[model samples]
Target: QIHDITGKDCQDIANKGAKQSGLYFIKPLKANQQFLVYCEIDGSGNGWTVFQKRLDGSVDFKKNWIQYKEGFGHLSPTGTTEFWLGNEKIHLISTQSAIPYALRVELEDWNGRTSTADYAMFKVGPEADKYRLTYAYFAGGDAGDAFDGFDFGDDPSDKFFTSHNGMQFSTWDNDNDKFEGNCAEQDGSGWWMNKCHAGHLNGVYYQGGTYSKASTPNGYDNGIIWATWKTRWYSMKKTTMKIIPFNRL
Candidate 1:
């Protein structure tokens, strides 16, 4: 269930019939912040106990304790019970800086006995950054295989891979011009390159090279080189691409 802990003290008991309990705070929390959660339990015997924490602050002692199906579950000890400590990093954009905050905890006993507790309050301390970018890349081919490269074109029509290279900065457009490139199909198997542009004109660039068995043969290969550049030209704040794929099918 749910309980409010704003400017007041509240307690709950899970004696016998009680299987779950919840605590909730009516305050608002920002995105990507750190918070600590504390809990206490008291029991006479030992058993497999399950504990859970959730952002919505709703607790379910029985099925909702360890698996985090509906709630985020963390394990706890059995028998000798007291206040236990647990904490997790708040996810980015968890709440839109609106709505009351809450924390839910669930406890389960070996004898089918379950209990839950919830607590809530206004979050304290420093908040998290509002804007941030996370980059990831995957490369394919023999050389890429040694570097944990993922198979890109396993499906005939699509045969390429990529990997994260680095970060670049540019003030061509409000200091938001940046691109990240990756090496594709290393080891003379094929040639492929990919890039991701964010902020000013967020978009992706894909380039493919051709492979030939005659002139240079293995070198350069008889593949196609294609690139799709996207960005916000004028009033468009969304991503738009400029397609340029070298070599024809």
Candidate 2:
């Protein structure tokens, strides 16, 4: 008996015959392995592979380097469950795509207003390099460029101090960040932190819009931060990080 099933990722599955958005087994392009991944096949007819998502704080994002590298959490049918699809997998998938991959960050504020950020390029280096984050060509979105540093207009001349573009993954245990302080330990999550971050989607999930250090565990200003839209103080309601094959448009 022979069956026909040849899909490298969610985009390939969509091109094949997936009409709905749900959980499906996929082998990343050029990677000799298969694993279950959530495929967002609906909504405007664009297929996406969701690598990270935060909703209701169901899954703890304050993980160790090993945990972050290997990944955690279960895949939900509705794709509402919180999870990280692992760095190694992301590196493999994004680096192997025939067309460059674009990153889409979807954010929802506490008041139900939503915003999005799109990047024309998104790729993470291999584990040997500590999974460095590199993105370019901002396609423009209402969310602003949170991954890059911003100038507060009156702050110091070093405006890129908090930029996270070319940073390596760091956790509470592994201090791979360039900052003097441990960003992950202070921020309550693992990420590619620079002096810190203008955006940290894996940070603590506070319950309200205006959250205070008094409500946090270690007086950390770490919530799902998307500085340009909601500022660093306001905690977001929901956030998702997905990748799609970039097609010049």
Candidate 3:
């Protein structure tokens, strides 16, 4: 019996001989509904579904819980595009895939320096569980271990307090972070803010690589942060949080 079948995800679309990258409608194998997603095809012949992206300070990421859940932004990857592809959609796509997925965080600083952080594993829980972040095995990157937090040096005691692994997503209104205070309210971004984050890519976008506390709403260094490579105070120029399914075994 021959029947037409749509791809379940960007990887599946790529597997079906889709070379051009753009917006795509995918219904995960187990998902009840389909949603639009951005498929970023690399020059090396890999298809990655971008869940979040920041190019310039055009779209504000300081959105409410419902807004974050519903998603908001331009569907295309053209100029001045920034968006967070809803937590609910992320959960469905990352979880319903047969082959496991890997996460890739690509970043660029104002000085034209570029870095990448790759995780061998990436998955998110459902909204009932607050879309908990589950990731491990930081494959490689010059960006350092920001998401999981790393020791400053050989001294193990000099570790960070803001470890994002297993942390639940938090917004300004919905507080699920481990911190005593609302980091989402202070940082002005929705994320897995544990005592705060070491890699807050959804933070305020600055015109340059550095921004003063006076320029921020809460007088904090809340610019797009990737602490390991630059630090919390230094804002990044570009960021992309994407995932690619692993090859079927």
Candidate 4:
């Protein structure tokens, strides 16, 4: 009782078609083979919960697993501050700040392999007008020690730069927030952006900032090189962030 998408294909299902409303199941193919492509979400809205099995032969309402490159995100109205597939970014705010919720991510495989897509789930708020994060580590943490550790590259068709490590966020046409993480390196390529609740001209990747050996958040004062700093944002649309002291976290 599952629809078929290639390589657990999600493009047709994520932003424009299936699963956007309630929640459903589909099967995508890889190497011309069919596997599972699950859902995570609703509420008032129920999404894939904090406890979903990744790539396992299990199913149910209580535990709806999903497939996201590097990882996936889910929504929950009654759900508590939680984590999914080991991600702490896409979470609920039952008892937290009024900051909007959003996550812009590149599509990946069961083993966390991203080769095809970039999706997002976006929310809005007063804080939505501005946002930023240190990519993988805690806020103000080590920028050099980003997630997946220095995996940078890109493609031709989409022209989106790919980085295994960097920051992910949203905003309101801020120039400063554009470049701050490994994701900013993709500035050369950016035309369309949408995702899991990902919005119009929304969902930006905070490029990975490099100390180039500065070894601290204050690397700029240490004489870091131009090629060793964060990228600048221009081509696409996103937010801004300041390198506040790391201890502010």
TM-score of each: 0.17, 0.92, 0.89, 0.22
State model 1's lDDT: 0.21
After TM-score superposition, what is the CA distance of residue 187 in candidate 2 from its true location, in Å?
1.6
lDDT by residue for model 2 over 1-249, one digit each (tens)? 111334777778778776788887777766777777888877555779899988798888888988898899778887778899898888888888456889999999878899999988789999899999988778889999888776545358435777778899999999998878898988878899887777889988888868886876677768888887876678889998998888722
Would you list the C-alpha lDDT of every candidate in the order shown? 0.21, 0.82, 0.79, 0.23
Determine which window of 10 residues in candidate 1 has minimal summed lDDT: 240-249
Write one digit per residue (lDDT tens) for candidate 1, span 12-127.
22222223223322221342332222223234211111222221112221221112112233323221222211111222212234323333223222233333222232121122
Model 3 residue 159 distance off true place after TM-score fit, in angstroms: 3.7
Which 10 residues in a row give candidate 4 its minimum summed lDDT? 189-198
TM-score for candidate 4: 0.22
lDDT of 3 by residue, 1-249 (tens): 111324787778777776777777778867788777778766666878888888877888989999888898877734246788898888888888446788889999888889998887689888899999997677778988788765545345434556788899999999998768898999888998787777789888788787776776567867888778886668898999888875521
Between candidates 2 and 4, the one scoring higher on lDDT is 2
Q: How many backbone clashes does every candidate have? A: 30, 0, 0, 30
Where does candidate 2 stray beyond 4 Å?
Answer: 1-6, 152-158
lDDT, candidate 3, at 186: 91
Flag the better candidate by TM-score, 1 or 3: 3
Residue 120 lDDT (model 1): 33
Query: Model 3, poorest ten-residue lDDT window?
Result: 150-159
